[PDB]
Amino acid sequence: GAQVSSQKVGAVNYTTINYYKDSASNAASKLDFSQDPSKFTEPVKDIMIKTAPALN
Amino acid sequence: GAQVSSQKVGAVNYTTINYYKDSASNAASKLDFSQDPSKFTEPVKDIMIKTAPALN
Amino acid sequence: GYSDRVRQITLGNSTITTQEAANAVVAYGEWPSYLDDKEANPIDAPTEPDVSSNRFYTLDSVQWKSTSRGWWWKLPDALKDMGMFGQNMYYHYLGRSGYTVHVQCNASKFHQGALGVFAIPEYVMACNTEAKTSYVSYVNANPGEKGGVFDNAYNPSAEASEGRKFAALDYLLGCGVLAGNAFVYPHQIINLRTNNSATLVLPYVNSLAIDCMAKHNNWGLVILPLCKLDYAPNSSTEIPITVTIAPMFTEFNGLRNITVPATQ
Amino acid sequence: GYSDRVRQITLGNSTITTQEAANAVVAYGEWPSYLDDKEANPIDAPTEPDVSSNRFYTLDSVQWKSTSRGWWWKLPDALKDMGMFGQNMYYHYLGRSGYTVHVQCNASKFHQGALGVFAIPEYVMACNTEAKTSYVSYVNANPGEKGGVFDNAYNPSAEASEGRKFAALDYLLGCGVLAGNAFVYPHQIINLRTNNSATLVLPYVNSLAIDCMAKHNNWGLVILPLCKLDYAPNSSTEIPITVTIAPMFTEFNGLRNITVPATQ
Amino acid sequence: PTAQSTPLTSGVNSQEVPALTAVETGASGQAVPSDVIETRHVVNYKTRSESTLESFFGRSACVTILEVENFNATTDADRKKQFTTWAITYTDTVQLRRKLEFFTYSRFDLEMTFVITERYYASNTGHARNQVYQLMYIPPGAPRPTAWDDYTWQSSSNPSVFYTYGSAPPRMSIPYVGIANAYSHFYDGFARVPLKDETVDSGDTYYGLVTINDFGTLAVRVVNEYNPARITSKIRVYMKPKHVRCWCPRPPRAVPYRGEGVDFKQDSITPLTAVENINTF
Amino acid sequence: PTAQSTPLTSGVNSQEVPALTAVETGASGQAVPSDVIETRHVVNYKTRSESTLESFFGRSACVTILEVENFNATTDADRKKQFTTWAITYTDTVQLRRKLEFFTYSRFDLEMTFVITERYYASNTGHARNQVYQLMYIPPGAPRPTAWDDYTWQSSSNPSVFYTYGSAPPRMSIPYVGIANAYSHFYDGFARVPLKDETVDSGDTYYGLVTINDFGTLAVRVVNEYNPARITSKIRVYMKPKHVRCWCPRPPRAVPYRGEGVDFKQDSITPLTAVENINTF
């Protein structure tokens, strides 16, 4: 049950096998590049178009 | 994700598996026999043919 | 015809209008909702009071002066004595609620000033004695609709028994962080030249599906003068700030006799 | 949402905004452009400095008072000491340029007044001695960013040597024509009740494809108070007028050592 | 996925005005350079890999220092030095705490690592054989030791780790153990509702997370009996949150902590150094 | 790939003259033996494997020696012996430095290895329990320790390695961390432009790479508290560049270094030993 994944590039793959029956034992979660800044930077009810006036 | 490669001959293959998620952790780069001495030994604009006069 | 400045909000038998709004905030981009079966916890059929309780309640108004340092409330605390919402809250062990918060402050085209209006999850504030930590009385933590005020000075008590209230120090947001960073929380600004109201719609926020409303406030509401009130003909003028809040998608579990909290 | 009153102009690393504009003028209906091969004259590959020079330069501001008679500048003279535009201008025998001219003057809803803003091709002005004709010094003709002012009186000099400057007589537009007819030139009006800025986009205008910038100004910029500034609480109040100008589609030929004009 | 590349743009003369907005709305400024300057095309190959939550928290941080000793104890005070108990928390130190407190709620598994060190108390009392340590996790309710060699250390059900001095730092993983659906870093409330006219004390009660949190106790002993030479030990406890999720960001701590709560200290509430003038480069 | 084989060639009598050239052009001589002698065929099976950059640099080289001690310090000077800080560099030693300086620019990952040794300071003060070391990498900006047991060592975010005396030499990899697209071994310039009529000092300013380089600090301590016996330690730091690229070759250092720059020393600028005569075999 080996997982082969891309490495973070340096100056290209690596292999992982989980040895333990509890997921808590696992190494770090894989890089998660998810983001949605707008839930904090623009949490407005009505859409604001940049090129338009903010208030009309 | 095992890589099998030729060994450097002695007086014929070996196996590598990367264990880490960062390429910086990897062992030495594979032998790179690339070369282009002419960028230092002959960096001239106009081609020089050995058998010809260097200056004509 | 339609405008970012003009809005109507109707909940139950109550309606708000504004003609100088600035859009509206939906905290973390999430509208409130009822608790789904796949996230539920207490198993008794809940009470969902709907229009009896999910309606606008207007708190006592406060006065903005050039010297005001700001105001705070907690939720659901501020609404604990509000009509049927309060009754449903206290007759049950458990409750959850979202809110529409509408803060109102009009002036004139010749006044100036700006209020930051922030909704803060788990708004834990500092106590006012250095002989103890986390040393705040239930009564002082839960002022109800009167809320509290910020101060620009910190004067902790000589004796521990006298400091069991919040040290609501304005520039540290009453909790040891710089007020200039409060904008990471859902917010609007009432800048008198631009708008006369702020509207924030808040989902239920907690690490649990449902919790004890009488023990635990989910949100703080903070109003801070970012730029002081000024009016040239009378620098001592005062203008009201009025806070009107509607519970939304209220849901209660664990019915019994009524909770009557200590008052002193 | 979009409005004749609200505009953004970006050139190079510079941006202007206005929220009380009145459209914009494109002189003679023609946007500036580079010189086509079929209209070209000097044959050396031209320098086209693009963003280094084609950007907004803000001149020293002037003060509009109830007694002001008006202001004038010449172009490219007014920009001769402006960053890389000035350097490219003086390192070359030949240059051509269009312009975006943005004149700025805000006040209040209680002030009144109106400025005529005119772009005049070949703005030749009268001299100030009647002992000679066309008798103006290079230094007085080319004041640079400070420009000059109009007067409501004509007082020619007793001696020819003392009158080698423009007789910038307001109602004759400094050149023997009635100022009321200046509207035949590309123009806007800054009428304080309506707008706080004027924007004029100017193509290169000349009887040649390209010319000697250090010898010859292609445009005059004239700002005349058509209706005097008035403000009831203080008739002696002054409000700034700020002129910001961007070269456009600049092109230069005949590179050599730098031109350093006489200063006295 | 990469951070944003910059498109080739020139200038504008337009009724579109991206440079203006109204932050009263609760929206932050949104404009980017292409909106307000002429830009070249720049391909951005750089990534935000090291600022993901897993990357930000992907470090073992020291959260406390415990002490235990091994010697022939003849007084109650000295008997209590033969073992130690510690209520598990991240508030004994400031660094990991401050990072966690960028957030209101979190959910993670924990890697715990320990560094154990010794020194001789004196040089005129011979030597000491290599020591084995027991680190026992006592969940809430389980009996706590009152002596280093009492029955609790048999640890039939509590997890214990036996560590041999000089061996690699010991390490174990702990699942997300919260009784809620996430951990709360802040709790604006109390553990019970005080009721009208009750006789329960209201003058010495506390507020916030301290009234409701309990992650159990770590108990540590030296398993060996005493040598003639007294040995004193330190146990440094390290925590690394892994498999991390967090919710509801907060301004970070701006002034010194003075305990487990959010309270601040009167002599330490002036974080900014005043500038000479508003125009100081 | 192999080095060049030699072809079978005889003699010539020809207008082709490969023996002559003109090095004024900037070209080196190009002629090979077959051009100027009669040659046999020789198959060349030999390779340039060991002179690739990876092979040339594929060694862990000592770059510095640090010292730390563990004893009961009662003076400021002795307190400062309980930990050490070192600005990370390759210029404390000469061998790796000289090899790197065959090139102007480089790009590589780094393997860092450490060798840690101890001795007793004296024999009349008993003994000392086995010591654990902390080696903490402090990137530029992170707080530097002022005492061996201050808060900085909790190392929530800085990488630290805890090493147990007697264990295998510790080792870690470091990525290419340069803020440029390659490391510069030489920088012909300054960190700022001094401007006309400014009051900033121009008499004590420096030049070159020293004005712009900063790879942070290594901080080392013994984690243990003091024993009666004072222990003194050395930490040797080793670097191996790996995954190496280099650009723009340079003549190698011909005379002794006298510091971090290219400066030379007046008593050591005569590398050649004079020959007796131009005709000396």
Ligand SMILES: CC(=O)N[C@H]1[C@H]([C@H](O)[C@H](O)CO)O[C@@](O)(C(=O)O)C[C@@H]1O
């Ligand atoms: C912790 C500590 O300071 N221990 C010190 C002891 C004790 O002070 C006395 O032995 C107690 O009486 O004294 C020494 O001289 C010793 O025994 O060699 C040095 C040692 O470091």
Ligand SMILES: CC(=O)N[C@H]1[C@H]([C@H](O)[C@H](O)CO)O[C@@](O)(C(=O)O)C[C@@H]1O
């Ligand atoms: C570093 C060093 O030289 N240490 C030496 C010490 C010290 O000089 C004195 O103890 C200090 O007073 O003296 C010895 O005779 C000792 O203690 O056995 C030998 C030992 O090698």
Ligand SMILES: [Ca+2]
């Ligand atoms: Ca906009």
Ligand SMILES: [Ca+2]
């Ligand atoms: Ca030749």
Ligand SMILES: [Ca+2]
């Ligand atoms: Ca119902």
Ligand SMILES: [Ca+2]
């Ligand atoms: Ca652009």
Ligand SMILES: [Ca+2]
């Ligand atoms: Ca023991």
Ligand SMILES: [Ca+2]
């Ligand atoms: Ca031959």
Ligand SMILES: [Ca+2]
């Ligand atoms: Ca130590």
Ligand SMILES: [Cl-]
């Ligand atoms: Cl109330």
Ligand SMILES: [Cl-]
């Ligand atoms: Cl000028």
Ligand SMILES: [Cl-]
């Ligand atoms: Cl036991």
Ligand SMILES: [Cl-]
């Ligand atoms: Cl034993």
Ligand SMILES: [Cl-]
């Ligand atoms: Cl300063």
Ligand SMILES: [Cl-]
């Ligand atoms: Cl520590």
Ligand SMILES: [Cl-]
């Ligand atoms: Cl220790």
